[PDB]
Amino acid sequence: ESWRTPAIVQELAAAGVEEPPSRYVLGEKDRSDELVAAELPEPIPVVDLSRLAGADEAAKLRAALQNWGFFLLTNHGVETSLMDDVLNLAREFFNQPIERKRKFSNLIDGKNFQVEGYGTDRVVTQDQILDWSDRLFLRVEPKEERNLAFWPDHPESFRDVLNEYASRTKRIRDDIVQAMSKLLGLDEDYFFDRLNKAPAFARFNYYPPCPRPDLVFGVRPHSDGSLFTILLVDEDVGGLQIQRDGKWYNVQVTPNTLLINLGDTMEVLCNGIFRSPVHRVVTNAERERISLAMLYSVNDEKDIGPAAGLLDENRPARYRKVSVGEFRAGIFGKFSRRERYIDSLKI
Ligand SMILES: CC(=O)C1=C(O)CCCC1=O
Ligand SMILES: O=C(O)CCC(=O)C(=O)O
Ligand SMILES: [Co+2]
Structure with a gap:
């Protein structure tokens, strides 16, 4: 009935909607870059966590983050029965009757929007084009701030399995940070001090099939605002595209592997x-396509700016140093917009 309450796309697709409603249809300029992406000209960067202390993988990790901003993590310790469980439980929640799922809506009373809950991202203006997907967005860290009213009670083991999966990726987070701290020549607890009691989120994306895959986006082109993201996809058949130098490339998260991409916070630090790849x-x-992304932010103690240990005489500050409040407002507000916030920081 109005633009502040957008539809659940899964139920639109399941209805057999003849064509995407105008609220999801892209403009002419945006539609010439999405229908066809190229393949990776160079093979996909892969890192083995079991030998990440070795000198060969560190060079592989350095090349990945400097040339692409993302890499496939293999041999990560997280058991496959756990990765399948969290994916299967996510699928069972999305396949519940809609009236059960609206109890976990992100529109409080069906009216006032908030981030946490089941739905889509914030609709700022009436003519804002919506993504062809829904997502279940939940906070996982710090645990004390967890709102279990939004954690699905059916299937009954969703809360325990997510809690168990989140702790496993948090340890992967700390192992990737220690390795990146060695590539930058910085001390480990520079990041850990900023990750102490820091926010972390779990985003369950559901990408329904579309009748016109050439007029919509599953998720808008964007870069994450986190430090980095740990992505998991359920039998990825395709869809994820990453940009480099204005050119889009297809990337496929093979089963049992975690894709890790850097966010805008890391590029500044x-x-x-x-x-940070768009x-x-x-x-x-x-x-349909289902993925779970674990987003790890920094806390609110230090300003968002280049690490002082990196600003020697040969390489000075290339970004501005900004307060944390001013940073999160820019990231949160530019996600629905075309321009990219982090570009305004470049000096
Ligand atoms: C943490 C933040 O970076 C993320 C979410 O807000 C929405 C999904 C994409 C990404 O931008
Ligand atoms: O669905 C994907 O493959 C990417 C996930 C993503 O971009 C996000 O949730 O921020
Ligand atoms: Co993303």
Whole structure:
């Protein structure tokens, strides 16, 4: 009935909607870059966590973060029965009757929007184009601030399995941080002090099939605002596209592997040594696509700016140092917009 309450896309697709409603249809300029992406000209960066202390993988990790901003993590310790469980339980929640799922809506009373809960992202203006997907957005860290009213009670083991999966990726977070601290020549607890009691979120994305996969986005082109993201996809058939130098490339998170991409917070803190990739998801006609992304932010203690240990005489500050409040407002507000916030920091 109004633009502040957008529809659940899964139920639109399940209805057999003849064509995407105008609220999801892209403009002419945006539609010439999405229907076709190229393949990776260079093979996909892969890192083995079991030998990440070795000198060969560190060079592989450095090349990944400096040339692409993302990499596939293999041999990560997280058991496959756990990765399948958290994915299967996510699928069972999305396949519940809609009236059960609206109890966990992110529109409080069906009216006032908030981030946490089941739905889509914030609709700022009436003519804002919506993504062709829904997501279940939940806070996982710190545990004390967890709102269990939004954690699905059915299937009954969702809360325990998510809690168990989150602790496993948090340890992966700390192992990737220690390795990145060695590539930058910085001390470990520079990041850990900023990760202490820091926010972390779990985003369950559901990408329904679309009747016109050439007119919509599953998720808008964007870069994450976190420090970095740990992504898990359920039998990825395709859809994720990453941008480099204006050119879009297809990337496929193979099963049992975790994709880890850097966010905008890391690019500023490492003074642009490593990059934060702009990425998107495109739909297709037949099959739905489910992914879970673990987003790890920094706390609110230190300003968002290049690490002082990285600003020697040969390489000065390439970004401005900004307060944390001013940073999160820019990231949160520019997600629905075309321009990218972090570019305004470049000096
Ligand atoms: C933490 C933040 O970076 C993320 C969410 O807000 C929405 C999904 C994409 C990403 O931008
Ligand atoms: O669905 C994907 O493959 C990417 C996930 C993503 O971009 C996000 O949730 O921020
Ligand atoms: Co993303």
